[PDB]
Amino acid sequence: QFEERHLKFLQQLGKGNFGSVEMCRYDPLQDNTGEVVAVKKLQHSTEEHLRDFEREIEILKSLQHDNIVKYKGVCYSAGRRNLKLIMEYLPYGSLRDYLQKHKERIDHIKLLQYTSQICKGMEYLGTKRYIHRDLATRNILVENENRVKIGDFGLTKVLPQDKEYYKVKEPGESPIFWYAPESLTESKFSVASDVWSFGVVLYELFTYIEKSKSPPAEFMRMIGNDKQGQMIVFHLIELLKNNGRLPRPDGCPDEIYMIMTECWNNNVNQRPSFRDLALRVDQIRDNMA
Ligand SMILES: C=CCCn1cc(-c2nc(Nc3ccc(C4CCNCC4)cc3)nc3[nH]ccc23)cn1
Numbered sequence: 001q002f003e004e005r006h007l008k009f010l011q012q013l014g015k016g017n018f019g020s021v022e023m024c025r026y027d028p029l030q031d032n033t034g035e036v037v038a039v040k041k042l043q044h045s046t047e048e049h050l051r052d053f054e055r056e057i058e059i060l061k062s063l064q065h066d067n068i069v070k071y072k073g074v075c076y077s078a079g080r081r082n083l084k085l086i087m088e089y090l091p092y093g094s095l096r097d098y099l100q101k102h103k104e105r106i107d108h109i110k111l112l113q114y115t116s117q118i119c120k121g122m123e124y125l126g127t128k129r130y131i132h133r134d135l136a137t138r139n140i141l142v143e144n145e146n147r148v149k150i151g152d153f154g155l156t157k158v159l160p161q162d163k164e165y166y167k168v169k170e171p172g173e174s175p176i177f178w179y180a181p182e183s184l185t186e187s188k189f190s191v192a193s194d195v196w197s198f199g200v201v202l203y204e205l206f207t208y209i210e211k212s213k214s215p216p217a218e219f220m221r222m223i224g225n226d227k228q229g230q231m232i233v234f235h236l237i238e239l240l241k242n243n244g245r246l247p248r249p250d251g252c253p254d255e256i257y258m259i260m261t262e263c264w265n266n267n268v269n270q271r272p273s274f275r276d277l278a279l280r281v282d283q284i285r286d287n288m289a
Pocket of ligand 1: 013014015016021038069087088089090091092093094138139140141151152
Protein backbone atom coordinates (compact mmCIF):
# COMPACT_ATOMS: atom_id res chain seq x y z
CA GLN A 1 0.00 0.00 0.00
CA PHE A 2 3.01 2.25 0.65
CA GLU A 3 5.03 3.17 -2.44
CA GLU A 4 8.78 3.38 -1.93
CA ARG A 5 9.17 6.63 -3.89
CA HIS A 6 7.13 8.54 -1.28
CA LEU A 7 9.08 7.32 1.78
CA LYS A 8 11.49 10.09 2.80
CA PHE A 9 14.24 9.02 5.19
CA LEU A 10 14.64 11.20 8.28
CA GLN A 11 16.81 9.37 10.84
CA GLN A 12 17.60 5.94 12.23
CA LEU A 13 15.62 4.97 15.33
CA GLY A 14 17.15 1.62 16.29
CA LYS A 15 18.91 -1.54 15.17
CA GLY A 16 17.79 -4.96 16.37
CA ASN A 17 18.11 -8.53 15.11
CA PHE A 18 19.04 -8.71 11.40
CA GLY A 19 17.97 -5.21 10.45
CA SER A 20 17.11 -1.70 11.54
CA VAL A 21 14.23 0.74 12.06
CA GLU A 22 14.09 4.19 10.43
CA MET A 23 12.09 7.36 10.99
CA CYS A 24 10.45 8.33 7.69
CA ARG A 25 7.72 10.62 6.41
CA TYR A 26 5.31 9.08 3.91
CA ASP A 27 4.55 12.14 1.77
CA PRO A 28 2.67 10.95 -1.34
CA LEU A 29 1.45 14.47 -2.14
CA GLN A 30 5.05 15.77 -1.83
CA ASP A 31 3.81 18.85 0.07
CA ASN A 32 5.12 17.98 3.57
CA THR A 33 1.69 16.94 4.86
CA GLY A 34 2.19 13.19 5.22
CA GLU A 35 2.48 11.43 8.55
CA VAL A 36 5.74 10.28 10.12
CA VAL A 37 6.00 6.48 10.23
CA ALA A 38 8.44 3.84 11.46
CA VAL A 39 9.98 1.61 8.79
CA LYS A 40 11.70 -1.70 9.60
CA LYS A 41 14.08 -3.22 7.06
CA LEU A 42 16.59 -6.05 6.89
CA GLN A 43 20.23 -5.00 6.78
CA HIS A 44 20.97 -7.94 4.45
CA SER A 45 18.20 -9.86 2.68
CA THR A 46 19.06 -13.51 3.06
CA GLU A 47 16.26 -15.86 2.02
CA GLU A 48 16.25 -17.25 5.57
CA HIS A 49 16.01 -13.77 7.10
CA LEU A 50 13.49 -12.81 4.40
CA ARG A 51 10.98 -15.57 5.18
CA ASP A 52 11.47 -14.92 8.90
CA PHE A 53 10.76 -11.24 8.18
CA GLU A 54 7.67 -12.18 6.17
CA ARG A 55 6.45 -14.31 9.08
CA GLU A 56 7.07 -11.42 11.48
CA ILE A 57 5.02 -9.12 9.23
CA GLU A 58 2.12 -11.58 9.20
CA ILE A 59 2.29 -11.96 12.99
CA LEU A 60 2.14 -8.21 13.66
CA LYS A 61 -0.60 -7.65 11.07
CA SER A 62 -2.79 -10.15 12.97
CA LEU A 63 -2.33 -8.40 16.35
CA GLN A 64 -4.84 -5.70 17.37
CA HIS A 65 -4.29 -4.58 20.97
CA ASP A 66 -3.85 -1.29 22.80
CA ASN A 67 -0.40 -2.42 24.03
CA ILE A 68 0.93 -3.79 20.72
CA VAL A 69 2.56 -1.48 18.18
CA LYS A 70 0.19 -0.86 15.27
CA TYR A 71 0.91 -2.38 11.87
CA LYS A 72 0.33 0.03 8.99
CA GLY A 73 1.41 -1.78 5.83
CA VAL A 74 4.27 -3.03 3.69
CA CYS A 75 6.47 -1.60 0.94
CA TYR A 76 8.79 -3.24 -1.59
CA SER A 77 10.71 -2.35 -4.76
CA ALA A 78 11.94 -4.17 -7.93
CA GLY A 79 9.30 -6.89 -8.20
CA ARG A 80 9.23 -7.90 -4.53
CA ARG A 81 12.74 -7.01 -3.34
CA ASN A 82 13.70 -4.87 -0.32
CA LEU A 83 10.72 -5.70 1.86
CA LYS A 84 9.88 -3.02 4.43
CA LEU A 85 7.46 -3.07 7.37
CA ILE A 86 5.52 0.16 7.98
CA MET A 87 4.46 0.74 11.58
CA GLU A 88 3.09 3.57 13.68
CA TYR A 89 5.72 5.97 15.00
CA LEU A 90 5.75 6.20 18.80
CA PRO A 91 7.28 9.57 19.68
CA TYR A 92 9.03 8.77 23.00
CA GLY A 93 11.15 5.85 21.80
CA SER A 94 11.99 2.65 23.62
CA LEU A 95 10.99 2.21 27.25
CA ARG A 96 14.61 1.52 28.21
CA ASP A 97 15.83 4.91 26.98
CA TYR A 98 12.68 6.70 28.18
CA LEU A 99 12.95 5.37 31.73
CA GLN A 100 16.67 6.19 31.93
CA LYS A 101 16.08 9.81 30.91
CA HIS A 102 13.02 10.59 33.08
CA LYS A 103 14.00 8.39 36.04
CA GLU A 104 13.57 11.22 38.57
CA ARG A 105 9.91 11.87 37.62
CA ILE A 106 8.67 8.27 37.14
CA ASP A 107 7.49 6.79 40.43
CA HIS A 108 6.65 3.20 41.36
CA ILE A 109 2.93 3.59 40.62
CA LYS A 110 3.89 4.59 37.08
CA LEU A 111 6.17 1.56 36.75
CA LEU A 112 3.32 -0.76 37.76
CA GLN A 113 1.09 0.90 35.15
CA TYR A 114 3.67 0.01 32.50
CA THR A 115 4.02 -3.45 34.07
CA SER A 116 0.27 -4.09 33.86
CA GLN A 117 0.06 -2.96 30.22
CA ILE A 118 2.92 -5.28 29.23
CA CYS A 119 1.14 -8.19 30.94
CA LYS A 120 -2.15 -7.57 29.13
CA GLY A 121 -0.29 -7.39 25.83
CA MET A 122 1.59 -10.60 26.63
CA GLU A 123 -1.65 -12.35 27.60
CA TYR A 124 -3.09 -11.30 24.23
CA LEU A 125 -0.09 -12.96 22.57
CA GLY A 126 -0.74 -16.17 24.49
CA THR A 127 -4.34 -16.38 23.27
CA LYS A 128 -2.90 -16.52 19.73
CA ARG A 129 -0.32 -19.13 20.86
CA TYR A 130 2.52 -16.72 20.08
CA ILE A 131 5.84 -16.94 21.93
CA HIS A 132 7.63 -13.59 21.91
CA ARG A 133 11.06 -14.94 23.02
CA ASP A 134 12.62 -11.44 23.21
CA LEU A 135 10.88 -9.58 26.04
CA ALA A 136 13.03 -6.68 27.29
CA THR A 137 12.58 -2.97 27.95
CA ARG A 138 14.62 -2.16 24.84
CA ASN A 139 11.82 -3.89 22.89
CA ILE A 140 9.02 -1.92 24.59
CA LEU A 141 8.00 1.42 23.09
CA VAL A 142 6.43 4.49 24.71
CA GLU A 143 3.46 6.10 22.97
CA ASN A 144 2.88 8.71 25.68
CA GLU A 145 3.56 9.01 29.41
CA ASN A 146 0.58 6.75 30.23
CA ARG A 147 0.85 4.02 27.58
CA VAL A 148 3.53 1.59 26.38
CA LYS A 149 3.44 -1.04 23.64
CA ILE A 150 5.34 -4.22 22.81
CA GLY A 151 7.20 -2.96 19.79
CA ASP A 152 9.17 -5.73 18.09
CA PHE A 153 8.43 -9.34 17.14
CA GLY A 154 11.46 -10.44 15.11
CA LEU A 155 11.97 -13.59 17.20
CA THR A 156 8.29 -14.42 17.78
CA LYS A 157 7.24 -17.99 16.94
CA VAL A 158 3.89 -19.75 16.68
CA LEU A 159 3.40 -22.78 18.91
CA PRO A 160 2.76 -26.11 17.19
CA GLN A 161 -0.88 -27.10 17.53
CA ASP A 162 0.06 -30.32 19.38
CA LYS A 163 2.74 -29.05 21.79
CA GLU A 164 3.05 -26.24 24.32
CA TYR A 165 6.69 -25.44 23.54
CA TYR A 166 8.74 -24.43 20.51
CA LYS A 167 12.31 -25.69 20.06
CA VAL A 168 14.68 -23.45 18.10
CA LYS A 169 18.33 -22.39 18.22
CA GLU A 170 19.19 -19.25 16.27
CA PRO A 171 22.76 -19.01 14.91
CA GLY A 172 24.25 -15.85 16.39
CA GLU A 173 24.11 -14.04 19.72
CA SER A 174 21.10 -14.69 21.97
CA PRO A 175 19.91 -12.51 24.88
CA ILE A 176 20.99 -15.20 27.33
CA PHE A 177 20.60 -12.95 30.39
CA TRP A 178 16.84 -12.80 29.75
CA TYR A 179 16.51 -16.52 28.92
CA ALA A 180 14.82 -19.12 31.09
CA PRO A 181 17.06 -22.05 32.12
CA GLU A 182 15.23 -24.53 29.89
CA SER A 183 15.84 -22.11 27.01
CA LEU A 184 19.59 -22.13 27.72
CA THR A 185 19.83 -25.92 28.15
CA GLU A 186 17.21 -27.32 25.75
CA SER A 187 16.36 -24.30 23.54
CA LYS A 188 12.72 -24.70 24.61
CA PHE A 189 10.54 -21.59 24.36
CA SER A 190 7.03 -21.37 25.79
CA VAL A 191 4.59 -19.04 27.51
CA ALA A 192 6.35 -19.94 30.76
CA SER A 193 9.72 -18.86 29.35
CA ASP A 194 8.15 -15.55 28.33
CA VAL A 195 7.04 -15.29 31.97
CA TRP A 196 10.65 -15.78 33.07
CA SER A 197 11.72 -13.00 30.70
CA PHE A 198 8.91 -10.77 31.96
CA GLY A 199 10.38 -11.11 35.44
CA VAL A 200 13.65 -9.74 34.09
CA VAL A 201 11.71 -6.87 32.49
CA LEU A 202 10.17 -6.15 35.89
CA TYR A 203 13.69 -6.16 37.33
CA GLU A 204 14.85 -3.74 34.61
CA LEU A 205 12.07 -1.26 35.38
CA PHE A 206 12.89 -1.06 39.08
CA THR A 207 16.61 -0.57 38.47
CA TYR A 208 15.60 2.46 36.35
CA ILE A 209 18.12 1.18 33.78
CA GLU A 210 21.04 2.05 36.00
CA LYS A 211 24.61 1.58 34.85
CA SER A 212 25.92 -1.26 37.02
CA LYS A 213 22.49 -2.83 37.66
CA SER A 214 21.73 -4.30 34.22
CA PRO A 215 21.07 -8.07 34.10
CA PRO A 216 24.25 -8.69 32.06
CA ALA A 217 26.31 -6.67 34.56
CA GLU A 218 24.79 -8.40 37.59
CA PHE A 219 25.05 -11.90 36.12
CA MET A 220 28.61 -11.50 34.85
CA ARG A 221 29.72 -10.30 38.29
CA MET A 222 28.02 -13.23 40.03
CA ILE A 223 29.70 -15.79 37.74
CA GLY A 224 32.87 -13.69 37.73
CA ASN A 225 33.97 -11.45 34.87
CA ASP A 226 36.71 -14.05 34.32
CA LYS A 227 34.46 -16.29 32.23
CA GLN A 228 35.16 -16.41 28.50
CA GLY A 229 32.95 -17.07 25.48
CA GLN A 230 30.94 -20.28 25.77
CA MET A 231 31.85 -20.75 29.43
CA ILE A 232 29.58 -17.77 30.12
CA VAL A 233 26.39 -19.68 29.29
CA PHE A 234 27.76 -22.81 30.98
CA HIS A 235 28.30 -20.90 34.23
CA LEU A 236 24.98 -19.08 33.85
CA ILE A 237 23.21 -22.44 33.58
CA GLU A 238 24.93 -23.70 36.73
CA LEU A 239 24.19 -20.46 38.60
CA LEU A 240 20.45 -20.59 37.83
CA LYS A 241 20.21 -24.29 38.68
CA ASN A 242 21.60 -23.48 42.15
CA ASN A 243 18.97 -20.73 42.57
CA GLY A 244 21.34 -17.85 41.87
CA ARG A 245 19.15 -14.87 41.00
CA LEU A 246 19.33 -11.16 40.29
CA PRO A 247 19.26 -9.06 43.49
CA ARG A 248 16.38 -6.90 44.63
CA PRO A 249 16.75 -3.44 43.04
CA ASP A 250 17.25 -0.43 45.29
CA GLY A 251 13.93 0.87 46.60
CA CYS A 252 11.96 -2.08 45.22
CA PRO A 253 9.32 -3.32 47.70
CA ASP A 254 9.35 -6.92 48.86
CA GLU A 255 6.00 -7.74 47.25
CA ILE A 256 7.32 -6.57 43.87
CA TYR A 257 10.57 -8.53 44.21
CA MET A 258 8.63 -11.69 45.11
CA ILE A 259 6.75 -11.41 41.81
CA MET A 260 10.13 -11.49 40.06
CA THR A 261 11.35 -14.49 42.06
CA GLU A 262 8.09 -16.34 41.39
CA CYS A 263 8.61 -15.64 37.69
CA TRP A 264 12.17 -16.98 38.07
CA ASN A 265 11.06 -20.50 39.03
CA ASN A 266 13.22 -23.32 37.70
CA ASN A 267 10.05 -25.46 37.61
CA VAL A 268 8.49 -24.44 34.29
CA ASN A 269 4.95 -25.38 35.36
CA GLN A 270 5.08 -23.46 38.66
CA ARG A 271 5.55 -20.03 37.08
CA PRO A 272 2.49 -17.76 37.25
CA SER A 273 0.24 -16.94 34.33
CA PHE A 274 0.15 -13.50 32.74
CA ARG A 275 -3.44 -13.04 33.91
CA ASP A 276 -2.41 -13.71 37.51
CA LEU A 277 0.55 -11.34 37.11
CA ALA A 278 -1.73 -8.54 35.91
CA LEU A 279 -4.06 -9.25 38.84
CA ARG A 280 -1.39 -9.02 41.55
CA VAL A 281 0.20 -5.96 39.93
CA ASP A 282 -3.16 -4.20 39.58
CA GLN A 283 -4.10 -4.89 43.21
CA ILE A 284 -0.73 -3.60 44.43
CA ARG A 285 -1.18 -0.52 42.22
CA ASP A 286 -4.62 0.09 43.73
CA ASN A 287 -3.27 -0.25 47.28
CA MET A 288 -0.66 2.43 46.58
CA ALA A 289 -3.33 4.83 45.26
C1 LIG B 1 11.59 -2.18 19.84
C2 LIG B 1 12.84 -2.21 19.44
C3 LIG B 1 13.19 -2.85 18.09
C4 LIG B 1 13.92 -1.88 17.17
N1 LIG B 1 13.38 -0.54 17.36
C5 LIG B 1 12.19 -0.15 16.98
C6 LIG B 1 12.06 1.18 17.34
C7 LIG B 1 10.86 2.10 17.13
N2 LIG B 1 10.96 3.36 17.53
C8 LIG B 1 9.96 4.22 17.39
N3 LIG B 1 10.09 5.61 17.84
C9 LIG B 1 11.28 6.26 18.38
C10 LIG B 1 12.48 5.60 18.63
C11 LIG B 1 13.57 6.28 19.15
C12 LIG B 1 13.47 7.63 19.43
C13 LIG B 1 14.66 8.41 20.01
C14 LIG B 1 14.44 9.47 21.03
C15 LIG B 1 15.66 10.38 21.18
N4 LIG B 1 16.11 10.92 19.88
C16 LIG B 1 16.34 9.85 18.88
C17 LIG B 1 15.11 8.96 18.71
C18 LIG B 1 12.28 8.30 19.19
C19 LIG B 1 11.19 7.62 18.67
N5 LIG B 1 8.81 3.86 16.85
C20 LIG B 1 8.63 2.58 16.42
N6 LIG B 1 7.56 1.95 15.84
C21 LIG B 1 7.85 0.68 15.59
C22 LIG B 1 9.15 0.45 16.02
C23 LIG B 1 9.65 1.66 16.55
C24 LIG B 1 13.26 1.55 17.95
N7 LIG B 1 14.06 0.49 17.95
